Amino acid sequence: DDPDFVGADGGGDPEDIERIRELGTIKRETQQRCVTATDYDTFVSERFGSIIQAVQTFTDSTKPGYAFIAAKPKSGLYLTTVQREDIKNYLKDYNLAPITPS
Amino acid sequence: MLFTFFDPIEYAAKTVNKNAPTIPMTDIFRNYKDYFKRALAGYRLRTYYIKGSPRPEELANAIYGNPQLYWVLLMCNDNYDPYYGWITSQEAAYQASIQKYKNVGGDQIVYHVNENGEKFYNLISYDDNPYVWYDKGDKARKYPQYEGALAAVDTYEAAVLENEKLRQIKIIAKSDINSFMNDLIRIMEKSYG
Amino acid sequence: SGEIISYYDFNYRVRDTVEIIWKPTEVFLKAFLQNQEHETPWSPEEERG
Amino acid sequence: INKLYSDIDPEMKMDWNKDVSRSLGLRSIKNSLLGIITTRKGSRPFDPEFGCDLSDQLFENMTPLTADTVERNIESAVRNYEPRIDKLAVNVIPVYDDYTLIVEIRFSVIDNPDDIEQIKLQLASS
Structure with missing residues (x-):
């Protein structure tokens, strides 16, 4: 353990019939896919923002099919590679078919 | 009844440590003693006596019918402490005396008082003539500072006379107590600004 | 000999290689006993005097 | 309702499990009553009217x-x-x-x- 504890977790109404409305009002908006730019990094930095301090997604119109994200591993001035293969891997799950994020 | 009158003040604990939070509190730091002089000076104080060993404010009711004004009595009494400044029963006083002397010693004969009432401190008779008194630290045999029959004072009894003095108080008439009240109040407005 | 001294959580997950120095100059541990005494209570007292 | 009106046990008896003993509901009501009656009037510090x-x-x-x-x-x-x-x-x-x-x-x-x-x-x- 860490020195933060309670005997158990879990519970819930579950519903809270009003509170769920939002949740329903929300998830209808959600995507499992990643598209645009800032959709990615969010979902991206959901993973190891502990490493990439902030991930900055961008493209270039001159070259389609591709996506760029900016990463400080914050352990180093340059993002180390082993991440770059680890991430893009895990990333690769959601890639808009015409597009290869990079 | 007073301190609630003025606005409560915020207070910083700075100078205990360079950073401590600031706290609001009801104000003790208006003097009130000068506040109750100026207004007080208008009328008069009337000496007064106490029937027993009551509490100041418990006693403050019977005179004025209002328990809330104890302080009026208090400032006319202007004692140092409300706890030991007041009349006190024999039981406590002795115990109080018991307390204060206990480490030194119990039942300590405090002083010799002559017939005339003159307290004689630090005195003992060499016992050959109990009427001649050589004081003490002397080993006697020398310099009896007095001769005759004197009383000695028991620390219990000693406690009594102390609290005894507290009996009479100077007070202001229950008639004027009201008329007085407004004036001081008005002064506090001048004292607010 | 057994058991464990301590655990390096590694902060994230890597593959195939690892390199680590102790930023406290290769010594990870400096253990500190300084200045405490346990016993001291507080109690009433007679002031004498 | 015996749960209600939880008051400290007037005696501060030792309760088993070591906590303060308690007067239960309607057990306290008596105590407060039993308290208010015996007290001499004027013996409350700031309330002279208390006590019978x-x-x-x-x-x-x-x-x-x-x-x-x-x-x-x-x-x-x-x-x-x-x-x-x-x-x-x-x-x-x-x-x-x-x-x-x-x-x-x-x-x-x-x-x-x-x-x-x-x-x-x-x-x-x-």
Whole structure:
């Protein structure tokens, strides 16, 4: 353990019939896919923002099919590679078919 | 009844440590003693006596019918402490005396008082003539500072006379107590600004 | 000999290689006993005097 | 409702498991009542009106008036400081030989105004 504890977790109404409305009002908006730019990094930095301090997604119109994200591993001035293969891997799950994020 | 009158003040604990939070509190730091002089000076104080060993404010009711004004009595009494400044029963006083002397010693004969009432401190008779008194630290045999029959004072009894003095108080008439009240109040407005 | 001294959580997950120095100059541990005494209570007292 | 009106045990008895003992609901109500009655008037620090006064002189000589006079005060006293009792009735029997007031009080807590319960109190020292 860490020195933060309670005997158990879990519970819930579950519903809270009003509170769920939002949740329903929300998830209808959600995507499992990643598209645009800032959709990615969010979902991206959901993973190891502990490493990439902030991930900055961008493209270039001159070259389609591709996506760029900016990463400080914050352990180093340059993002180390082993991440770059680890991430893009895990990333690769959601890639808009015409597009290869990079 | 007073301190609630003025606005409560915020207070910083700075100078205990360079950073401590600031706290609001009801104000003790208006003097009130000068506040109750100026207004007080208008009328008069009337000496007064106490029937027993009551509490100041418990006693403050019977005179004025209002328990809330104890302080009026208090400032006319202007004692140092409300706890030991007041009349006190024999039981406590002795115990109080018991307390204060206990480490030194119990039942300590405090002083010799002559017939005339003159307290004689630090005195003992060499016992050959109990009427001649050589004081003490002397080993006697020398310099009896007095001769005759004197009383000695028991620390219990000693406690009594102390609290005894507290009996009479100077007070202001229950008639004027009201008329007085407004004036001081008005002064506090001048004292607010 | 057994058991464990301590655990390096590694902060994230890597593959195939690892390199680590102790930023406290290769010594990870400096253990500190300084200045405490346990016993001291507080109690009433007679002031004498 | 015995859960309600949780009050400290007046004696501060040792309770098993070591916590402060307690007067339970309606067990406390008696205590507070039992507390308010005995107390001499004026003995509260800032409240002179508290307590039901007793004059041993008047306490010495009982008359249906003197009884009645006392009969009001308690009924009066309890009524002011104890809202937990809705319907309350006092009975005082002064006893001639030792000059002792014994007092019965039937009262009803708010929650069970139809229920009736009485207490037996006697007073002495004439």
